[PDB]
Write a protein that binds this ligand. Sequence first.
Ligand code: NA
Lengths: 92, 92, 92, 92
Amino acid sequence: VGSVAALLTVVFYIAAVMATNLYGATFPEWFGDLSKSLYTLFQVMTLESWSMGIVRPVMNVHPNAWVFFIPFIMLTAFTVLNLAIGIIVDAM
Amino acid sequence: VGSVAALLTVVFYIAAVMATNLYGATFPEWFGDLSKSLYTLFQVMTLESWSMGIVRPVMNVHPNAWVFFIPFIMLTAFTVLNLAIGIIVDAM
Amino acid sequence: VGSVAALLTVVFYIAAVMATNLYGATFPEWFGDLSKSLYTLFQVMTLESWSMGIVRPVMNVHPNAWVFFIPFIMLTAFTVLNLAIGIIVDAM
Amino acid sequence: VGSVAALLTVVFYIAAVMATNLYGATFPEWFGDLSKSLYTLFQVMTLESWSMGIVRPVMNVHPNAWVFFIPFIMLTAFTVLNLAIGIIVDAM
Ligand code: NA
């Protein structure tokens, strides 16, 4: 349960380091810092305005940006579901 | 568990093939080719701007478009919940 | 499990009959028919643009509209969670 | 199960009292009084337009506003998941 929470934090950093590098120069408001990126990657992870607000505008410059976001969305959604079930196990 | 993941992929393709055909000519940005559709159907599946952003604009041209989207939303939401429970079973 | 699915359909109709009556004349695009209402109440139920898109604009005319929507959101979210768990029970 | 529902209500009030104080004067439409805040904190809790619609505009004035919202989002999401599992326990 704690192993999952640690793994996510690790993944989230590598993701926000990568996103900064890839989209930072072109999209400074969302990916211009490691911190600006950590926030957007959290916003995308909760799914709030992920596509119409972030992904679609990013793709008008980087047409393959979906290769980054869609997996990140699937990965974090699986990690969160795995973390959600881990709490249920601790009960039973 | 793997059977569900395979079934969804099958359904998602038939859905994106259909969506391309039905709304492609009229809504090229979201359903203009097979991939454009696959992305929009994923966006609709995560629920991000599904109605105000996609479905409502599509219905101003195709007033019965809801017969396609609403079931797709219910189907994928059930398939995902079924896939979510399948992972819980593998634990126990 | 089937009892819950039946109860929701009943509730959804009474809700969409009520919403039509209350907000129909003032908000014809979202609540001007029983069908227009069934769609908005589904969109609100999935949570897509529920507040910034629907509830907040409705409250600029009907300032107590939240007494209708917030409970409907809580009720349907509980009914859906109850329906979600009912499927898990059928497995075990 | 009832203990969780009580705890959330307590937390939600302290959060809405705080939000009113912190962002009230600057953002009167969303945090202008205790109720305006209670509604916005519920809207943020369901995740509807939490970032692009609320948090990002608030940060253009209060750049550390994320220290309030992101934890509130994580806290309520955990409290709700804990409340969701509590209902499953009552079945079994
Ligand atoms: Na959501």
